[PDB]
Structure 1
Amino acid sequence: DTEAHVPDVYEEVLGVVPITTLGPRHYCVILDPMGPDGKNQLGQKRVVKGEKSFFLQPGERLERGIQDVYVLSEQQGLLLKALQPLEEGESEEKVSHQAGDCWLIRGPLEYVPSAKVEVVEERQAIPLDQNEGIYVQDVKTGKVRAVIGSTYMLTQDEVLWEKELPSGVEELLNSAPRNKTRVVSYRVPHNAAVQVYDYRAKRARVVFGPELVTLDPEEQFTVLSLSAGRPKR
């Protein structure tokens, strides 16, 4: 229709404008969304995602206005998400997560956060040179390892792990704030050797030659207090 207001002195509340969602990239959450009862589901929430013309029924509101679909950072773009309530085979994974048991989805997909899922970290995978790396610690295991060589994204249970020696920082930068999670590595000069001891593994290693060494999570550089002066201090 296009019907006359005050059909019998009735309150025009407003002319409501239809929220419309951009096919190729738009979604949203409506709160108090009415199911069959024609009346609001007060606590609940509904996500709608495609191209749609949408009228917010009375007592519906939009949670976060008009959010656009996550389309990942791709080769390396990551979302990490917990889950408010328990739910199985519900997400676009058709796999079971227990309430809270958070996880990550990455790769070449577009994501709409499910009703029951919450986007924790918008993770970004770190590009790594053939010969450089980062330390990760497994929150779950406690396991602190060095990931070196290729670019990496930290698995759901991982996070970056820092370290450094009390003076070694200076002979290394031989400054910008030294990044404590980037794998410590040092170019051993042509006619030199450096003595490294792994402390967690109890692996001694003396690396000679012109090669570079990189220190595994626990291992330390041996330092040397050498004399030098014209009068030799």
Structure 2
Amino acid sequence: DVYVLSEQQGLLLKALQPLEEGESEEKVSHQAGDCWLIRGPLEYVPSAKVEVVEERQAIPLDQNEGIYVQDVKTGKVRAVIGSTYMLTQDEVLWEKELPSGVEELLNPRNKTRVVSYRVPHNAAVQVYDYRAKRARVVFGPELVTLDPEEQFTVLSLSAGRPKRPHARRALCLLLGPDFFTDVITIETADHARLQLQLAYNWHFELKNRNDPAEAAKLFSVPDF
């Protein structure tokens, strides 16, 4: 049967034989050793000069969400989001992965689709680019979509009545007023030891959302 097919459907078509510039609907030349995808709301039949390869299908998508792709040729990798998008003749899904940052991120997955993380308006997170080396920051009630190479700058918050840095971890920075308690012992000059329970009110100032450098100050500390 003729391969009648919806635009959502697609067929890569490797050719066993050299050029088909003649009698092709596109009239385009096609040397052997490299080939192309075909898609669109139309019927199609393989030529004797070319063979069918695979039934790549629609990859439905909405705004602010998508999947990774990488060329087999140049090797360049990029996320794509928004409109529905099939892999082209060479692009292929790529496997992003994280250094145990995933379970916190949740607080089974097809990693090839672009990872994303909703950010609470009080929260802020760092992404230190390894491509353009342009580290950047979000601060507000919005989701964030990574470039595949841009790892999060996860932070290790202290926790417990004693302040132990290793005790907790949170990629988000809850920089709101919410005071944190603290306990530090001290001793008087007359050698009289005493314990203390002492709360700390705290909040980070922001002259502007606009200035990255202040955020660089926000992240300059390993553990504020």
> Structure 1-normalised TM-score?
0.66
Aligned to 2:29: 96
Structure number with the higher helix fraction is 2
- Please tell me whether residue 190 in structure 1 is matched to residue 118 in structure 2: no
Between the aligned residues of both structures, percent identity stands at 93
> Shift of the alpha carbon at 1:71?
1.3
Q: SS at the partner of 1:110?
A: coil
- Map residues 53-92 of structure 1 onto 2, 5 A cutoff: 68-72=1-5, 74-88=6-20, 89-92=22-25
Matching residue within 154, 158, 181 for 1:223? 154
> Shift of the alpha carbon at 1:171?
1.4
Aligned to 1:210: 141
**Distance (whole Å) between structure 2 residues aligned to residue 79 and residue 227 of structure 1:** 54
**Distance (whole Å) between structure 2 residues aligned to residue 179 and residue 108 of structure 1:** 29
- Please tell me whether residue 178 in structure 1 is matched to residue 102 in structure 2: no
Q: SS at the partner of 2:92?
A: strand
Matching residue within 35, 44, 48 for 1:115? 48
Matching residue within 57, 72, 80 for 1:124? 57
The one-letter code matched in structure 2 to 1:99 is: A
The one-letter code matched in structure 1 to 2:45 is: V
Superposition CA RMSD, Å: 1.4
Of structures 1 and 2, the larger Rg is shown by 1
**Distance (whole Å) between structure 2 residues aligned to residue 168 and residue 90 of structure 1:** 55
> Shift of the alpha carbon at 1:125?
2.3
**Distance (whole Å) between structure 1 residues aligned to residue 29 and residue 7 of structure 2:** 25
Aligned to 2:99: 166
Is contact 1:197-1:203 (8 Å) kept?
yes
The one-letter code matched in structure 1 to 2:113 is: R
**Distance (whole Å) between structure 1 residues aligned to residue 51 and residue 91 of structure 2:** 18
- Map residues 2-17 of structure 1 onto 2, 5 A cutoff: none
Is contact 2:64-2:145 (8 Å) kept?
no
Unaligned runs of 5+ in 1: 1-67
Q: SS at the partner of 2:58?
A: coil
Aligned to 1:19: none
Aligned to 1:53: none
Q: SS at the partner of 1:121?
A: coil
The one-letter code matched in structure 1 to 2:54 is: E
Structure number with the higher strand fraction is 1
Is contact 1:130-1:149 (8 Å) kept?
yes
Q: How many residues align?
A: 163
**Distance (whole Å) between structure 1 residues aligned to residue 24 and residue 161 of structure 2:** 73
> Shift of the alpha carbon at 1:94?
2.2
Matching residue within 139, 142, 150 for 2:75? 142
Aligned to 2:208: none
> Shift of the alpha carbon at 1:104?
0.8
Q: SS at the partner of 2:156?
A: coil
